[PDB]
Design a protein around this ligand. Sequence first.
Ligand code: FAD
Ligand code: FAD
Ligand code: FAD
Ligand code: FAD
Ligand code: FAD
Ligand code: FAD
Ligand code: FAD
Ligand code: FAD
Ligand code: FAD
Lengths: 171, 171, 171, 171, 171, 171, 171, 171, 171
Amino acid sequence: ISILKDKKLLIGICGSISSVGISSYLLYFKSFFKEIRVVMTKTAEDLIPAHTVSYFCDHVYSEHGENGKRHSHVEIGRWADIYCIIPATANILGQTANGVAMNLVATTVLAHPHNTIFFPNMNDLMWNKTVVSRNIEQLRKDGHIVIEPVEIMRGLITPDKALLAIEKGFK
Amino acid sequence: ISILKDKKLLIGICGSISSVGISSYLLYFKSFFKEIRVVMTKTAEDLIPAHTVSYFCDHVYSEHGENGKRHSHVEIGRWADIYCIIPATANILGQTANGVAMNLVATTVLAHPHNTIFFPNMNDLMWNKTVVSRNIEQLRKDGHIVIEPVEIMRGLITPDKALLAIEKGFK
Amino acid sequence: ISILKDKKLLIGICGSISSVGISSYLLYFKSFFKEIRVVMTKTAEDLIPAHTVSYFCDHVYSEHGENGKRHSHVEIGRWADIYCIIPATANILGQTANGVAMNLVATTVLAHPHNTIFFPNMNDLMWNKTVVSRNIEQLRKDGHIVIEPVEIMRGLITPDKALLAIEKGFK
Amino acid sequence: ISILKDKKLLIGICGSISSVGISSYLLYFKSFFKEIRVVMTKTAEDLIPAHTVSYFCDHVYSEHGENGKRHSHVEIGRWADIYCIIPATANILGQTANGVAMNLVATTVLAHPHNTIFFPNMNDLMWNKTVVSRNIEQLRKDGHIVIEPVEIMRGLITPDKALLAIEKGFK
Amino acid sequence: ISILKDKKLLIGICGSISSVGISSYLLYFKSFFKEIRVVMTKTAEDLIPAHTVSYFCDHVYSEHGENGKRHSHVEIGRWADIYCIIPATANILGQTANGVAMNLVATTVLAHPHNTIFFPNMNDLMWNKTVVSRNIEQLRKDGHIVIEPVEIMRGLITPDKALLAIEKGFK
Amino acid sequence: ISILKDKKLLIGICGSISSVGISSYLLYFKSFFKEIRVVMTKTAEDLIPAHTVSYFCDHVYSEHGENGKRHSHVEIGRWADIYCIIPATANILGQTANGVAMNLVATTVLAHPHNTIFFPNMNDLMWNKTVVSRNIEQLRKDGHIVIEPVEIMRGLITPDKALLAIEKGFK
Amino acid sequence: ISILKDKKLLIGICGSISSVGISSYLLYFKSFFKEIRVVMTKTAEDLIPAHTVSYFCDHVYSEHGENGKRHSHVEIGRWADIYCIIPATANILGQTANGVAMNLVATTVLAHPHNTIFFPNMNDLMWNKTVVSRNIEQLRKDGHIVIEPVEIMRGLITPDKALLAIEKGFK
Amino acid sequence: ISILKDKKLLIGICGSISSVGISSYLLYFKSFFKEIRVVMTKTAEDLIPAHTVSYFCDHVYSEHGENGKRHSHVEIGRWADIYCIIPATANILGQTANGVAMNLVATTVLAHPHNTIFFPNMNDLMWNKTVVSRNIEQLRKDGHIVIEPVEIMRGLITPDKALLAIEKGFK
Amino acid sequence: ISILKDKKLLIGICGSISSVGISSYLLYFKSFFKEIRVVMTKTAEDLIPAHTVSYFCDHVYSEHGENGKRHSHVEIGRWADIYCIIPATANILGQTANGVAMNLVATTVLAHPHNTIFFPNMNDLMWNKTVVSRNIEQLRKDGHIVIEPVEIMRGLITPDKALLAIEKGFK
Ligand SMILES: Cc1cc2nc3c(=O)[nH]c(=O)nc-3n(C[C@H](O)[C@H](O)[C@H](O)COP(=O)(O)OP(=O)(O)OC[C@H]3O[C@@H](n4cnc5c(N)ncnc54)[C@H](O)[C@@H]3O)c2cc1C
Ligand SMILES: Cc1cc2nc3c(=O)[nH]c(=O)nc-3n(C[C@H](O)[C@H](O)[C@H](O)COP(=O)(O)OP(=O)(O)OC[C@H]3O[C@@H](n4cnc5c(N)ncnc54)[C@H](O)[C@@H]3O)c2cc1C
Ligand SMILES: Cc1cc2nc3c(=O)[nH]c(=O)nc-3n(C[C@H](O)[C@H](O)[C@H](O)COP(=O)(O)OP(=O)(O)OC[C@H]3O[C@@H](n4cnc5c(N)ncnc54)[C@H](O)[C@@H]3O)c2cc1C
Ligand SMILES: Cc1cc2nc3c(=O)[nH]c(=O)nc-3n(C[C@H](O)[C@H](O)[C@H](O)COP(=O)(O)OP(=O)(O)OC[C@H]3O[C@@H](n4cnc5c(N)ncnc54)[C@H](O)[C@@H]3O)c2cc1C
Ligand SMILES: Cc1cc2nc3c(=O)[nH]c(=O)nc-3n(C[C@H](O)[C@H](O)[C@H](O)COP(=O)(O)OP(=O)(O)OC[C@H]3O[C@@H](n4cnc5c(N)ncnc54)[C@H](O)[C@@H]3O)c2cc1C
Ligand SMILES: Cc1cc2nc3c(=O)[nH]c(=O)nc-3n(C[C@H](O)[C@H](O)[C@H](O)COP(=O)(O)OP(=O)(O)OC[C@H]3O[C@@H](n4cnc5c(N)ncnc54)[C@H](O)[C@@H]3O)c2cc1C
Ligand SMILES: Cc1cc2nc3c(=O)[nH]c(=O)nc-3n(C[C@H](O)[C@H](O)[C@H](O)COP(=O)(O)OP(=O)(O)OC[C@H]3O[C@@H](n4cnc5c(N)ncnc54)[C@H](O)[C@@H]3O)c2cc1C
Ligand SMILES: Cc1cc2nc3c(=O)[nH]c(=O)nc-3n(C[C@H](O)[C@H](O)[C@H](O)COP(=O)(O)OP(=O)(O)OC[C@H]3O[C@@H](n4cnc5c(N)ncnc54)[C@H](O)[C@@H]3O)c2cc1C
Ligand SMILES: Cc1cc2nc3c(=O)[nH]c(=O)nc-3n(C[C@H](O)[C@H](O)[C@H](O)COP(=O)(O)OP(=O)(O)OC[C@H]3O[C@@H](n4cnc5c(N)ncnc54)[C@H](O)[C@@H]3O)c2cc1C
């Protein structure tokens, strides 16, 4: 676990209501990694502004770029030692599973030297769809890790569990 | 057939010249269902304004949301008892077949509890492409229904045929 | 080779730094074909303006349309005798391989009567990703041609090689 | 406590990083009150969009109005049985303590028939300023309730404590 | 009363539904003063356009300035012999009572050589709030005049009463 | 005096014609402090652009933020060792005296660990108003310093006097 | 010197940091001339707003016109008895010296009946450039006056010196 | 004269009140040349819209380009057999005389294979300025023709005279 | 040649089709200098975006400034040890030759301590114009270097030749 203290973590945020709570993960991970940055999708930004998310991490890469210049997928892909997408949408799973990259989050997956760990989150109806399962499987077959969501009173596993999943994957 | 009189129908409209005539289907289906709403893709709206389509149905969900707020896929997906996409583009077929959802129409497919019935419509050159056929097949294997288009002096089957196809699928 | 002098060539440009140099190919191909036009993706235009690219070819079809009217994929797809996408992104490969068409470049592939020849270009990390290779293969299995990039002091083969690849494919 | 199940609760959100987590309070209070609505200040909206906050309550009144029409302070002030401002800024405390109302949140305080319960939240440096304390006192002397923040590893008391404070004040 | 025929009157209009009827006062005062001008707050303008109010007086100073240049508080403050704010909001009372000036109306109070006469108007709930009364008192202690509103089938006293109140104050 | 050479100075500029000459103070103070930054109010910026003021200091914090993100009051408040507002408006005096903070300048006063030194500047009519004097007094009672303006052929004391006043206050 | 008390003075302001202090000259000249107006270049306005400069003179002619109508060079050129450009940029010197007039300031020089007096101000590197000297000379040969800048702890001569230079030139 | 019936004429219009009457020349020249097009400067367009001028000639090239693409100076310069600038401003004379080209009109002069004939028009004060005369001379020395303006109850010579001047120059 | 490895190079890009290929020079010069930055004219940016050019150098100064603030000519002029304009337009030659500076590129020439080396590029018709030659000569007489263009199957000399020309001039 102490091995991460000197690693660069990139968190890709996708469109989900649970993204609004991303600070819980972000603040918890702050003490375990060397540096943490974020890359968001358009839907994620509409839910929670990139400027808001910047109060909980070192830098936020927006799909809209900075001053009209699109951020570099190869630069952020190489910059990061670990790329974790949380939360991941059915869409992002479908795009990455099939080599499609219509936004920076999906593009970065292809440009990151290592495999990507996904933390899916979606409506139960969506979660039980054949394609999603097929997509998840395909990603695994391809080498990516897919932390399953947990049922609750479905959702993401608490920051601590998530941290452990990140550490385990980094092998 | 009289079983539908008490069902909620959601029609997803995609980018096609034939969308301009969607009122023919919409007005014909009005007497057979409890309520009919529409969800459109951006290209469909550029061809025929959502406000225009609203004169032929109960409500139109736009990709652009309402007052800047994106409409809910889980809400419209659950709201509807039957989700029928007419006309369906090669694009929508390719997205749904592979679990990709870059617009509300494709997302709703994943968020609807039941399977979706598709009414493809495209250029003959496009229709004969290997991928399209593979995509259509994959959708069927996945459980979705795909009403084939008919050749004419290719296109969609008249409102009456279409209605029958909807009724048959609802089993 | 002299057979091309009377053929219409459509070049689809995708998002890559190498697109900035597209005039080298465009000007070189000018003497071998009857007429050459271009169709670009949004990212390609942000890198090199459609108006700039218009100084090196007969016409440039933008994703943004002309006067707010989207250009026709069936019209440009049929207009062209040969459709060559250079440079091709992982994204375009992933979209075309799976029958997804979210931009004019990918849509045109489905609307062109013949198969399309692709000239991929991307970061080496991206090039070695499993999905890309799978996508490339799938395109070949589907009938499309995929000119591989070459390593250099990876990139596109010079205009002359490329021309030859176009001629060979036209059979 | 069961007396609240039939009361209308209005929550005024002000500019604070802690506003991003307002769903925790909002969702927790949902089962104890008849209906819950929100009224926000401009700074609060820049941090967390009104549309986001609308996924956790019945309605959100923005400073920007609805379709260009400013929402009514007398209407929302009278509509609500209980008006609770959480989180409250030094600014809102200073405005309300002195009868100044430059935004809907502060105006509503004057237009609500009953007294308002405040849940201050600010930087410790700000919290120890003479004026703030004087303002807090003045509000109390005026009849308003001011739930003090708690020190932690200062902040707002958990949703449950807060609920209790609301119930106690409603007397 | 005939002493006013040669005095310059400045009327500050604040945000209130009763501002819509300001012409009644404005037209009635036209024959008793040398010249009458108006200065409005943003809320007042949203209710009744400055251009509308200009049909009932000699000039209207807007918070938005003229051609992007903010109007001068010292110039309008000195220009006027009598400065009367009707209708006055709880907000304006709170700002002036405490030396705060966030808009031209409140700023002018500080820049006018003489004391200002206020004609408050607000919701009864607001009128009975402790702070308002304290603010009104403070203004009086400071030297300003505050014409109380009258109950009706609360509101402003008719133009004629108001005129008398202006004359009495001018001593 | 040489004690300041290693202190961080923050200058808050408010809306006054005298702000146009702020470079005289800014350039004079440059050799006595470790670093000097500025924070402006909206009115100050309309008079003299933040970009202009940036040619005479190390950084200028605008009310409008940077790239749409509001600057941090706690960050700039803590960053600075000494916070001096010159020129200070009646408005800023009224806001700070009463714990109201509707702009960054006033907010920073509450977020700065130490007391703030004010250099008021306004029209003589405004200066002789009861509220202003009461506000000035209240600020002093609260611990803030208020350098009075001087009459001239009223205004701010020359840069040199001002520097001395800063040094004296820093005790 | 008393001869000027009845003359119209037009001051053209160009792009220079020293323009920010133009009020020193403007206010000093106010008592010696019948009336003083200003005409600015775009760069000068970006440094110090035309509305700001209007507080120190009778009228400011902007390059942007008034309500979209370009101000008249012949009207302002004829209106003025004396046209003095302070500060003058290398650019304005180069334009006027060569009969080029791309902005109102340079155009007015050609439209003014009399010769123009220039008060150059620029970086020392720029001042020592061959072209500038040649341009200055050419202007003199043409009849215009060019008050040289003075070295200091280069810059413009104080308002008083400048006034004298204006008086001397008016012969 | 009949030699022109088969020549392409390009008329460059500059900023002058007399440009408003350009149709008189344009319509008169229509029967003597093969084709007539126009190229305008920004000031000319503000006086008389390019669309207006298009009712009196075959095509109008605007400084603003067409659909955001700047028109080609080499294309229009080569297209035309004769390039005549009427009316010509002091500015255009100064730019062309010195090899400066900040707008399409001046640039075209350099890109036209042949010499350009100018029809100056300006205020008499401007016309008597040394630089203008020097500029006119320089243009002649360079090979360009400069039809002098005539005094009237100064202005341009009637369309007929102008036509003759064009014919004479074409040798 | 190895003397340059520790020098700062500023490249000014002007409006020319050949600017699109500027990366060839930029990338080639990267290994010979300490650092390379670019300053562009408006026309150059319309042809090839500043963000594009930023992928081939350390920084790009735009005429439009950064965040609305114009970049400093004295700062970039002094920053650079060598200032080379490639490609140079007839316009830039005409402006610099005559001491006119209407854009940052031309202004920087005057603000750079040393002489500037120009690499002209234009249409042959333009190149043979008397004024251009006169302008080129004048620049030389003034001390600037002007690398002539070469005829080809006219244009700029390859990056390697250009590098040599830079080295030779640096003496
Ligand atoms: C409140 C809410 C909660 C949701 N929660 C989930 C969830 O938990 N799980 C799930 O699988 N789906 C969820 N969705 C749906 C999901 O957002 C959609 O399927 C979406 O199409 C894909 O989201 P994304 O984040 O993967 O990609 P995105 O890239 O954000 O794509 C979606 C939208 O982005 C726009 N877009 C992309 N790039 C740009 C650009 N450069 N400029 C302008 N627009 C651009 C598209 O036009 C489209 O409308 C939610 C939607 C909403 C509105
Ligand atoms: C007149 C016309 C008729 C056509 N008929 C057919 C047909 O019969 N069959 C067929 O298969 N194809 C047809 N097409 C092509 C099809 O529209 C394209 O393949 C398109 O890319 C996909 O269309 P869609 O409706 O599936 O999806 P869409 O979601 O409409 O995607 C297409 C366009 O939507 C834009 N877009 C998506 N979300 C947003 C957003 N939030 N904001 C802004 N833009 C957004 C994209 O940028 C893109 O240009 C037609 C095109 C035109 C112009
Ligand atoms: C400088 C640079 C160089 C790159 N080089 C490569 C490379 O060599 N190889 C590679 O595989 N990838 C490369 N990429 C990444 C690639 O651009 C991304 O994966 C992109 O998402 C897909 O590009 P595209 O050209 O295939 O499609 P695009 O259709 O251009 O999709 C990408 C962007 O287009 C927007 N978009 C689509 N339609 C519209 C519309 N109608 N209106 C507004 N926005 C629209 C999307 O919202 C999205 O941000 C590069 C990116 C940058 C910034
Ligand atoms: C990330 C962040 C966190 C903060 N956390 C705290 C905190 O915990 N506690 C605290 O006391 N302060 C906090 N502040 C500071 C506080 O936001 C400021 O003092 C602010 O001036 C007052 O906030 P408000 O919510 O009370 O009022 P607001 O009404 O939001 O006033 C602040 C801003 O609103 C603008 N505004 C008001 N009405 C409109 C309108 N109709 N249109 C456009 N703009 C309008 C103003 O111009 C001003 O910039 C924070 C600021 C930031 C940027
Ligand atoms: C229909 C209606 C009727 C009302 N009637 C009363 C009443 O009778 N009595 C009463 O006490 N209150 C009344 N109010 C409420 C009162 O308008 C609010 O308290 C308001 O915040 C203060 O109003 P004002 O006129 O004093 O000041 P204002 O200066 O108008 O302040 C209110 C609004 O002005 C905006 N604002 C200020 N300056 C600018 C600027 N330069 N640019 C853009 N926005 C600016 C603020 O952001 C804020 O939303 C009413 C509100 C409405 C909508
Ligand atoms: C040329 C001139 C000189 C002046 N000189 C003095 C003087 O010497 N002394 C004095 O006491 N008063 C002076 N005033 C008046 C003073 O500017 C007003 O009282 C003002 O309301 C308060 O100024 P401020 O700088 O304290 O605050 P500000 O915060 O600048 O408040 C004033 C204006 O700011 C706007 N504003 C605030 N935040 C935002 C935002 N985020 N977006 C958009 N608008 C916003 C308001 O709507 C309002 O119009 C002057 C006014 C002018 C026009
Ligand atoms: C902070 C600063 C200080 C400077 N100080 C000096 C100095 O002391 N001496 C000196 O010689 N140079 C100085 N310069 C440089 C000088 O501003 C430039 O050479 C400039 O190109 C010419 O300035 P001008 O005032 O003569 O003309 P301007 O007419 O202001 O020309 C410069 C800018 O004006 C724009 N412009 C002109 N008309 C319009 C219009 N109608 N609409 C939109 N834009 C228009 C141009 O596009 C160009 O960017 C300074 C620049 C800056 C940024
Ligand atoms: C009603 C009127 C009549 C006039 N009559 C004459 C006359 O008879 N003779 C004479 O010599 N002068 C005359 N002038 C003055 C002349 O217009 C000015 O000297 C002007 O600066 C040069 O005009 P132009 O047509 O040569 O060039 P222009 O290129 O039109 O230059 C002038 C204006 O163009 C703007 N401009 C240039 N390119 C662009 C662009 N791409 N986008 C936006 N703005 C741009 C500049 O910023 C500047 O304000 C007149 C001016 C007016 C207002
Ligand atoms: C595709 C193309 C290729 C060309 N190739 C050459 C060539 O090889 N050689 C040659 O000598 N000429 C060439 N030209 C012509 C040259 O661009 C024109 O003479 C131009 O007027 C001067 O270009 P510049 O780069 O020197 O200056 P620029 O400063 O770019 O001046 C030209 C344009 O800039 C605008 N402008 C300047 N500052 C601003 C500002 N702040 N905001 C908005 N607009 C501003 C003007 O209004 C004007 O339209 C070409 C033109 C085009 C369209």
